[PDB]
Design a protein around this nucleic acid. Structure first.
Ligand SMILES: Nc1ncnc2c1ncn2[C@@H]1O[C@H](COP(=O)(O)OP(=O)(O)NP(=O)(O)O)[C@@H](O)[C@H]1O
Ligand SMILES: Nc1ncnc2c1ncn2[C@@H]1O[C@H](COP(=O)(O)OP(=O)(O)NP(=O)(O)O)[C@@H](O)[C@H]1O
Ligand SMILES: Nc1ncnc2c1ncn2[C@@H]1O[C@H](COP(=O)(O)OP(=O)(O)NP(=O)(O)O)[C@@H](O)[C@H]1O
Ligand SMILES: [Mg+2]
Ligand SMILES: [Mg+2]
Ligand SMILES: [Mg+2]
Lengths: 447, 440, 447, 440
DNA sequence: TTTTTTTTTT
């Protein structure tokens, strides 16, 4: 058969090197002359490397002279072939991608050649035992993996991790500057464990229905918007934006939401709401999309659109994940949830922004005597625990027990925190204003 | 005939995508791969989408390589075809218009195909009745409408929401509704917490059997009909309309239901019932559908019919959700529950009408020592808690405990209330009259 | 293609109208002249409508004269064609079904024509937008539905229900009753609360094993048979019919069942049994089927057969519901029970007959200290509670407690009564005679 | 090409099975029906297996009758072919060697087929990445190696048990190991009782994560590394590399972890950290490879991979053993933990490494009245009470009791210990630096 | 996912 190769990518790389010499470093880091399929291409890249190591700039005339001095001008195709290669390449903007393609082709060809050698050894043992052939095959595959050892790698070795250790110590010397390392949550206790909303983090705040989960998420959004100027993006899939705005005005102005909903408001609270609206129009960093049944592709497109138009996005609010709908994986809810979580994590890593993705719980919580939520108590759990890093659960024993002494005290229990120890953050909930504040009472030592 | 297509617009879109990658978002929002008439164009757009999702820029060489890796380079026409497509397109200034034309052609061809399928079903009944074919055609046309309704989406600025909110607040402040924002329940305490039956709300009042749940729902219906002129629509799937009317007459005239059911009534109560009938004929806003095993689509069609004919609908009553039948998801009951709840919520949002749908409970409530209902006590809740916003539960400790001091006292406990606090409303129940009144 | 039409049905309708004029109203309500496929048939029906509106009877000669006066006799086919149409039709008994068929064909042809119009509009946009075409298609399909909406509808009016209710009230008030409006139970206290066995009611009397459950059901059956002449239908799923008849003779003649079982009976009780058999042969209204593992479809077919043969059914006795077998829902018992209960309630509403179906209880009742049955004690509860209306439970503290003073006293406690207050009716049970009788002892005040 | 096969050896094996039924066990252990090159030979061996499992002796006539009953007599070549096969074989003395040759041929053909599959995957990527192809090839070679396994169980003879027992007695008596026998644990009480970190052992410490258990395993890793240069491996599923590094620096340098995490600039702690990392660089055997969500078979494969890389594993640190949750067994964790423990013991015996795991217990450790880790506090008891060879339980009464009865005498209670006296091992812990010391 | 009903055991 024909070995898998991309001659066009090689020609594009050679033309870009003939035009641009600053991107030679990326090519040298990525590929070598052996990655070139044709032996003339290997000779051309070898001459280019020799000229660049000598400090000579990479152009057509000097390369032609260098090939003529070594006599390789006729071996590579002549000066007309080099001129054609220089002519064909428009630009070297995507020469890194071309080099990646060439490296992939070289890896596949090396794998095919190794497979041919292994099959030849299998057909003709030549006195080698089965264990000998197995070890030879393992060594060959490990050598193929070792060819990209600096590319495919994970945690580092002792010396390199010690250099990373001293570098991180020098970095964390600068850490006591504000205490909050990410987006400020507005809560002192929350900014101690989590140290604020870290970028590229999946924040899963899950609670029972009518537990203030949307309310606390809105409070977090308000605190972030007052503590930053980067625009936020809200996807209120469950509730309309009218109720969201009513909750925001009740929380910020500390006025009863019932009176706002009935509209029976005095002029003093009206002036407070007007001042809050003036502050919001000063900010104008909030964008709410109340459409329901949206795919993660649409959300990603809108997020990229806003980031392009408004210069990045401060916060992404999602109104609970089981409302999100994918037509492709609508057959199975768990597959749909896993796909949604994976796409949202990819988007969060893409734009480097903490995404507020709420979630619901299961009915096994009420079955348990202790109604403190766990990771397995999550509605369609599993992949959610895998993809997320900042999972939290709202607990209100006042709701479950009428005689509970934790009235107003809402406990945010961290289920998963990859970077930092988990814990229980107590907060003071005001149902009238729907306001979550820092718990100013006596601190409880978690047993 | 030749299907209506604009291949030149497709070529212009593909060439503009090859030239410009910044307007890729507009093309992705407008059209998909299936909108392309020719299958090679579908493959080309699929490869472009795969490359752009990976972050790779859209150029000729990378696209050709990507098609070569999957072996689809020869399927789409070869690299020369791609080079020709890149050469032909001058610019991508009007690529949005070309994509709109392509989407229009695709939707028109979809409509033509649906019409052909409808004609085929008409010529070949395959044992289906005319109603089945009509409902299938309605479903197909609704699907085509949903395919076009996705354009009206997009995040909005905070200022517009603020203006709408303050306008609504001023409207509520000017109107002296005296707390009751929605449809008046007829109960003062219920008009304090819920502030009346708000439009586009899914009200789930679930209770145990023989708890007056249907009776209390009928009392709510009577109160709404007396306190409004907008016509109501009743779907009495479980109980016959005759029993519903007897319960209504017993409740409104405050006469014993047993005496009315036996017919042993004096002429004074007869005159009271006659006056009640005169008031009802003065209103004539009540329409009861005692049919059972109904799909939500039939309910939606009848609701739209009555709303257009009678100028909107004040209230939509459902006689307990597990009686409803969906043949599509009849294999699993929870799928039926989720579909019914979603369809009812969508219908309530559509016609802006409060819908009161009853439900049943589970035996786990009986297992608990305290028999106060919770959200998990719902009979296959699932998305019931998520979609609904005005869930209430009826509690009568007099039934469970003979020595209970809550005789006549019915506790309507709000399981879920998104806007406002939840609580327990005490009411006075008259078994003889089957009358729910405010507790004193 | 050929449009879907039934010329034979049209010819049958025309011949029936030529023969029968009393069923013209059904045809006019069902179909119009436009529903006829062929234009001559439209002309014929138009002429028939014109003659009937004028009051002229619909016969061959007058119709021929009317067509001759308008000159349409040649257009419809001639007098010989009309004579052939009159000849071919045997009878007009099924002319309503024929008109329904013609209406169906007309609706299908209308749908096909509308689909053709929509396809033509799709092929030629004529400058219309896709929204315009969608609205036009919706309008056309809704016009088809509205043409099909000119029939019996679900929500009719409140006035019709009011008239039916007041007619029922007048019917019940003009008849002097003894507090019984349904089938008389034969027990005075039961006739106070339940007011007799009401038709279209699912009566569930459930108890423990033994406990005289089938015995009490048979006592109710005997009382109903003695107090009415409408035939009753028993499905003795559990017990053989021989033992059923032995228990019936023991209860009715007040003789010990054990002596009848042994056959050692005196001539006086023999004469009493002979007189009871003479009374039964005077009645001859009870029809018993002892077949087991029956589907509800077979039961419904047999019930319809008996009602057609013997002019309705007075009462339907079902001997214990878990004996009923459905092959389709044999996988899950609860689904099978729900389907059986739904089918039985549909049958009871269909024929307007009281159906007393027996059932069993759960062992959790024995787990409780107080062994008074509740709704949840029902075996495979839920749908049983929902579909039924007259649920009762048998309680015998004499069985549970040897020192109980309720010996002979059986408490029938109403668990569910949709219309009326529930209670506890105590009866006198005779184990020797196996006879349930009205309470001759002190009636205890229920708390 | 012609696949490498030895039909003559197959004929010899089949004829020997026809002659001798006593050596059927050797052939059944060695080869299967799939190892036969020709499908008729596979059918013949399948019929032989079916006859011998039924207890019927394997002869020509019964085999032919069974093949005729299944209709396979004509497919394999007829009765004359079977008679020829029986005639050809002289004896069954060397049938073991012939079966070994047949197994070798089958394994070589399997390797050739796998190589052909890999070459096909290389020629046709089908959208898969090169990493996917490499992982698939490694999986295929590992499957070949796993299929190249042999007998693992068997009732041992009394002589072998006596030899092992007397060897154990001589080890306990004659050897003057003076406490430590394997890798030095560091804790003096663990040095005496557990006799060091014995290679090919299963040491599972059952406690709460970030509650002294993580720093206990960290101190174990440190003490093991300070006395040997054998490459140790890190598999922490609880904390990242940076946080584990901070914990290790705080433990070794005796510096408060608040200063380690929150930067308190001073040169004394910096000098202690510099000395600690100098000692670590002197050891030069800490290879970080911590991840999450794995299985012990994957851990064994990575152990083989590291042995290919360097060779020899000093210690593997499994932090948060309850982070490998399989959703099938996530609810009842006992069976999953038992299977993980058995596979970890198999891995420990495989590469001679003292596999140490950090099992997570329940919240009842802080809730139950019995604050010590007993079956209620253990995760559904079961695999935490048994199975594991060294099940240590960290009764840190500091966390469980606010007024602790164990401050510096926190009990490392050993439920089961193969070598050493069980009991409550009271040890000192420094909460400031997260450092576990050794109480006398 | 949901939802019933049985034993065992802690
Ligand atoms: N005016 C008010 N007075 C008192 N409590 C109120 C008022 N308005 C709202 N609440 C409470 O605030 C909470 C509303 O929380 P909310 O965030 O809307 O629930 P939710 O988490 O979004 N529901 P879900 O999405 O199904 O989980 C409830 O506990 C209400 O009782
Ligand atoms: N005339 C009457 N006298 C006394 N009590 C009565 C009378 N009529 C009805 N009741 C009681 O009032 C309640 C009415 O029951 P009902 O309205 O059917 O509740 P329900 O929820 O609709 N039953 P279900 O459909 O199974 O859930 C029951 O508790 C009856 O026992
Ligand atoms: N001669 C007798 N003397 C006393 N008790 C008797 C006599 N004959 C029958 N019984 C009682 O009659 C009862 C049987 O009633 P029956 O109605 O058949 O129960 P059942 O319906 O068969 N229960 P089940 O089998 O679960 O459906 C038992 O309690 C017997 O003790
Ligand atoms: Mg919410
Ligand atoms: Mg009801
Ligand atoms: Mg019985």
């Amino acid at each position: 058969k024909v070995p898998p190769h991309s001659i066009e990518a090689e020609q594009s790389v050679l033309g870009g090197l003939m035009l641009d010499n600053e991107r030679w470093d990326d090519v040298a880091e990525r590929v070598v002359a052996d990655d070139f399929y044709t032996r003339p291409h290997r000779h051309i890249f070898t001459e280019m490397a020799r000229l660049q190591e000598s400090g000579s700039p990479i152009d057509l005339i000097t390369l032609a002279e260098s090939l003529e001095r070594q006599g390789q001008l006729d071996s590579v195709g002549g000066f007309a072939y080099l001129a054609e290669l220089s002519k064909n390449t428009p630009s070297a903007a995507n020469i890194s991608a071309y080099a990646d393609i060439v490296r992939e082709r070289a890896v596949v060809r090396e794998m095919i050649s190794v497979a041919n050698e292994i099959a030849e050894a299998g057909f003709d043992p030549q006195g080698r035992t089965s264990e000998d052939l197995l070890d030879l095959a393992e060594s060959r595959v490990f050598k193929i993996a070792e060819s990209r050892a600096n590319k495919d790698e994970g945690p580092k070795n002792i010396a390199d991790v010690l250099d990373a250790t001293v570098a991180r110590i020098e970095q964390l010397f600068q850490q006591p500057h504000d205490g909050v390392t990410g987006v400020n949550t507005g809560y002192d206790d929350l900014n101690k464990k989590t140290a604020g909303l870290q970028p590229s983090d999946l924040i899963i705040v899950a609670a029972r229905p009518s537990m203030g989960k949307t309310t606390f998420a809105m409070n977090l959004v308000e605190n972030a918007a007052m503590l930053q100027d980067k625009p936020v993006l809200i996807f209120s899939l469950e509730m309309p934006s009218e109720q969201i705005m009513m909750r925001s005005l009740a929380s910020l102005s500390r006025v009863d939401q019932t009176k706002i909903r009935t509209g029976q408001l005095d002029d003093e609270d009206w002036a407070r709401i007007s001042g809050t609206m003036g502050i919001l129009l000063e900010k104008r960093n909030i964008y709410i999309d109340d459409s329901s049944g949206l795919t993660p592709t649409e959300v990603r497109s809108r997020a990229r659109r806003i980031a392009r138009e408004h210069g990045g996005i401060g916060l992404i609010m999602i109104d609970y994940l089981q409302l999100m709908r994918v037509p492709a994986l609508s057959d199975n809810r768990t597959l749909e949830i896993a796909e949604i979580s994976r796409s949202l994590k990819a988007l969060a890593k893409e734009l480097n922004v903490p995404v507020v993705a709420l979630s619901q719980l299961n009915r096994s919580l009420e079955q348990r005597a202790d109604k403190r939520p766990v990771n397995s108590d999550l509605r369609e759990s599993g992949s959610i625990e895998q993809d997320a890093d900042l999972i939290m659960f709202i607990y209100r024993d006042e709701v479950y027990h009428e005689n509970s002494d934790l009235k107003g005290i809402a406990e945010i229990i961290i289920g998963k925190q990859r970077n930092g120890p988990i814990g229980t953050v107590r907060l003071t909930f005001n149902g009238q204003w729907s306001r979550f504040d820092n718990y100013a009472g006596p601190q409880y030592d978690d047993e």
